[PDB]
Amino acid sequence: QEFLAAGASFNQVVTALERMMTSQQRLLSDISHELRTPLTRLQLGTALLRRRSGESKELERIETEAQRLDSMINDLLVMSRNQLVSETIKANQLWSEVLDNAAFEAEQMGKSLTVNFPPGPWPLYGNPNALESALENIVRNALRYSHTKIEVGFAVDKDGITITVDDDGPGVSPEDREQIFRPFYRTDEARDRESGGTGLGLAIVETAIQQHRGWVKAEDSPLGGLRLVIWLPLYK
């Protein structure tokens, strides 16, 4: 009872702490509830379109990118009140969809996205969501900060998978190349760029790969821009 002032009832301290310790969980839990309802509307609209104009490749795209949003809103409502989760996955199962999307988006950008070698049925053990996010972020970094080409190659051996993403955009100067995995950081060249956005991307990448005992590098790219290499280990 060292927590409120010197004379509060026992019921008073009980409730005082209960508010104190559930406050961020409830904020997230409510932020979660609030994102859900406009998405739910957005989904009813697509339903009502499919009822009228019927099936459509564009529609199906909206229809599923909706579903991705619905899933992640459900992740917030989970891990808010929880405060780690892992399972076994094959690499093709893991990242194929990430790459197919990278393709659809690269085409909309009018940019060439090539996958030199694709992920095989290679054993990983970890968090599916985290690893997808790791790959998607360095790929879409490359999609954006590139001029025209984007290249992605997978490599496997007894020890594990090595993903290599290349672009022909501007490089990242050697000095900046270390600090770009730190949160909210952007190269001086990029905040000057008309591109805007939080420096969170590569920071999410580093913490997902480091939590799977892997590593990430930023390097010179044979394509002229920036090379990003992920390395994860296989599972026994």
Q: Which residues lie near ligand ATP (CB under 6 A)?
A: 137, 141-142, 145, 167, 169-170, 172, 180, 185-187, 190, 197-203, 225-226
Which of Mg ion, ligand ATP, a second copy, none sits in contact with 167, Cβ below 5 to 8 A by type? Answer: ligand ATP
Nearest CB to ligand ATP, comparing residues 28 and 234: 28
Task: Count H helices and E strands in the chain, helices first.
Answer: 7, 7
Q: Residues 174, 178, 97, CA angle at the centre, nearest 5°?
A: 105
Stretch that binds Mg ion, among 113-121, 165-173, 177-185, 198-206 (CB under 5 A): 198-206
194: helix, coil or strand? coil
Count of residues touching a second copy (by CB under 8 A) = 108
Q: Which amino acid is at 87?
A: E
- Is 182 labeled as ligand-binding? no
Distance in angstroms (rounded) separating the CA atoms of residues 107 and 223: 19
Check residue 56 for interaction with a second copy (CB under 8 A): yes
Could you tell me how many residues make up the chain? 236
- Is 27 labeled as ligand-binding? no
Q: Is 33 a catalytic residue?
A: yes
Check residue 187 for interaction with Mg ion (CB under 5 A): no
Beta-bridged to residue 124, according to DSSP, are 89
Longest dimension (CA), the chain: 70
Distance in angstroms (rounded) separating the CA atoms of residues 228 and 221: 8
Which of Mg ion, a second copy, ligand ATP, none sits in contact with 142, Cβ below 5 to 8 A by type? Answer: ligand ATP
- Is 140 labeled as ligand-binding? yes
- Is 145 labeled as ligand-binding? yes
Residue number closest to ligand ATP, CB atom: 201
Beta-bridged to residue 166, according to DSSP, are 151, 227
CB 232 to ligand ATP: min, Å: 19
Active-site pick, 12, 19, 23, 33: 33
- CA gyration radius for the chain? 22
Check residue 46 for interaction with a second copy (CB under 8 A): yes
Contact between residue 102 and residue 132 where contact means Cβ atoms under 8 Å apart: no
Q: Please, what is the end-to-end C-alpha distance for the chain in angstroms?
A: 50
Check residue 224 for interaction with a second copy (CB under 8 A): no
CB 71 to a second copy: min, Å: 9
Residues annotated as catalytic are: 33
